[PDB]
Amino acid sequence: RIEREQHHLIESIEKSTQYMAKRRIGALISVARDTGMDDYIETGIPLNAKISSQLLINIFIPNTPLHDGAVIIKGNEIASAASYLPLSDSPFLSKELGTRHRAALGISEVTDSITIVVSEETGGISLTKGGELFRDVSEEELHKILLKELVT
Ligand SMILES: Nc1ncnc2c1ncn2[C@@H]1O[C@H](COP(=O)(O)O)[C@@H](O)[C@H]1O
Numbered sequence: 001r002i003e004r005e006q007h008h009l010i011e012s013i014e015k016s017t018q019y020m021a022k023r024r025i026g027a028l029i030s031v032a033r034d035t036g037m038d039d040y041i042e043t044g045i046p047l048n049a050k051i052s053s054q055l056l057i058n059i060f061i062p063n064t065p066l067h068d069g070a071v072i073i074k075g076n077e078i079a080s081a082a083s084y085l086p087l088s089d090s091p092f093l094s095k096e097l098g099t100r101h102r103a104a105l106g107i108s109e110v111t112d113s114i115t116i117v118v119s120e121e122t123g124g125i126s127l128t129k130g131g132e133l134f135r136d137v138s139e140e141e142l143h144k145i146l147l148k149e150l151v152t
């Protein structure tokens, strides 16, 4: 069932981001939707892998081949790792945030994707959507947002 994959995806993002937030591991996960992100998948290393919290964690371990860039989830697959996303040049984004946030903001400005960031500085979890940034969200807030936006 597609609903079982969607709840598994939400659960996979929740557990992986909690694990990386606790250890201040930077992360950048873009979930494609109606708007295609195929051009950005082509920039990364193709995985075409089943979604799991364990694989998402292993990708973002620092100083590893797959950690430098964005993971893109498409359908029920982790499509790619270490992909480029377009950077926002918006001057409204706080300068205390990192390039991952700028990339999450940039992709959200030109797609309808949902993008999750884990800051390697603070461990806070942020989300971008439609050019907006939800900064340092709680587990409860992250859960409700993913439920509302990823479950059809
Ligand atoms: N255009 C981009 N698209 C996706 N991820 C990026 C991009 N530029 C930088 N990154 C990520 O941000 C990290 C560097 O962050 P910083 O040290 O704040 O510049 C890189 O190692 C990548 O993981």
Ligand code: NA
Binding pocket: 048, 049, 050, 077
């Ligand atoms: Na596969």
